[PDB]
């Protein structure tokens, strides 16, 4: 348990660079409530600075979580993002998607997003850029890698896949 190294923050922002553009700089420059990044045995969390300061009084083996968990570094050195990060991503979501209110249940089950849901997804979305889903409520449901561009997805058969699902709020059903 130690403060995130400057090198590690580079990869952390690179992973965040997908769902969020360069605006991610607006996630720590606010300064209204300072926040810092902390890691606990390959697991990283986004925590306020003031609350994180006193957290050091607890030994690392006893601390299970702090603030909001963002992701965890893999044994190979890569970085993966958990559903818990979805709470913060909503504030700076560069690209967004949606799914039908009568077809959201498969998405919560880990199924991919199909073209059967049609509408007005945000334009200029790259083919593989990440997206975030809402219901009727602007409530985040998950995030995943896109599968087709804005033009390609619209002019496609309803059975085609438009986004690869990799995380969703359904993880809390256990």
């Amino acid at each position: 348990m130690r403060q995130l190294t400057e090198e590690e923050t580079k990869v952390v922002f690179e992973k965040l660079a997908g769902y969020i553009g360069r605006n991610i700089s607006f996630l720590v420059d606010n300064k209204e409530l300072p926040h810092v990044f902390r890691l606990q045995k390959d697991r990283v969390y986004y925590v306020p600075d003031h609350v994180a300061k006193l957290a050091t009084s607890v030994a690392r083996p006893n601390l299970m979580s702090l603030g909001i968990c963002l992701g965890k570094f893999t044994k190979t050195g890569k970085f993966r993002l958990h559903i818990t990060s979805l709470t913060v991503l909503a504030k700076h979501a560069k690209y967004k998607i949606w799914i039908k209110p009568n077809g959201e249940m498969p998405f919560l089950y880990g199924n991919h997003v199909l073209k059967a849901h049609v509408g007005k997804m945000s334009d200029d979305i790259p083919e593989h850029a990440g997206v975030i889903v809402f219901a009727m409520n602007d409530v985040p449901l998950g995030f995943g890698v896109s599968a087709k561009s804005t033009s390609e997805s619209r002019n496609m058969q309803p059975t085609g896949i438009v986004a690869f699902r990799q995380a969703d709020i359904g993880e809390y059903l256990r």
Binding site: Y109, G170, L173
Partner: protein
């Protein structure tokens, strides 16, 4: 025959709900009375750790009942789960 978005890391090994039974026949060797009670959890299914993870009910599986008991019959061949309290 097995016991049961809950699945997390399982592949296309879908198990029909017809194979899931919530109650088992429990008998006490020291008492001449038997009670039909719900199945709580599977402790150790032999013949595989994956069987224990999936909650199969093969013969010899050790289970717990809401009052430990072990299944003595083959539910897949008769549709019933007979267990004897340990």
């Amino acid at each position: 025959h097995t016991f049961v978005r809950r699945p997390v890391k399982m592949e296309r090994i879908i198990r029909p709900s017809a194979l899931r039974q919530k109650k088992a026949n429990v008998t006490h060797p020291e008492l001449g009375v038997t009670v039909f009670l719900p199945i709580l959890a599977v402790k150790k299914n032999p013949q595989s750790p994956m069987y224990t993870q999936l909650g199969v009910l093969t013969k010899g599986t050790i289970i717990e009942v809401n009052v430990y008991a072990q299944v003595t019959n083959e539910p897949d061949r008769d549709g019933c789960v007979n267990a004897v309290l340990l």
